[PDB]
Amino acid sequence: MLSFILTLKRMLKACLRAWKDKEFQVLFVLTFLTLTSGTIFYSTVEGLRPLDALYFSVVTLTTVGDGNFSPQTDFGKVFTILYIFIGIGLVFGFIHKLAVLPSILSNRKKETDAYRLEVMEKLEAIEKKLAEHSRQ
Template structure:
């Protein structure tokens, strides 16, 4: 249980450090814009409610894909393919940035312990 708290502490330190960097801020803005574009697209083209459009956009970007909602038009299906590829790229970049920062924090902590 104690190890879990240490892990959460390190993760929170990592996220605070990440969000101070321009790279992370740019990823957050890009993700927000793509999420908004997807929500508007699915609302207008697939005639989903705004909450369903947002939910479907998030599930697609996060690569979860529950399957409870899905596009029914050809343009919606084609858009979803491109949208999913963008989502995979954004998720991969975000995980990479966070992982890099976790490694940096670990290296800093090891240097402190070695001194």
């Protein structure tokens, strides 16, 4: 149970580590801009409360879906279709980003070079010495 708490503590730091990745934040910014963007629309087009809007906008981007309201106006169906698409666009972005070791490979390189350098320089001297010896 100390286990539970200690783990959760690490995980929560990992989010914050991501939450300072520029790209992740662009996505969050885009999500929110798109979120209030829809609120602006369904509010002041499809005629709906500035909270009944946010509810449809969220229920739709996340693909849950309201069991009652849908776009009435044919204009409000066009938007919803293309909106939904920005949804997918976004959820694609995250899945890509949530699926990225690059640093472990840097150390391997930092050590393999230092090694391979010495291997070379050792071999070099050996050859240079076996040369000067097998003459004089």
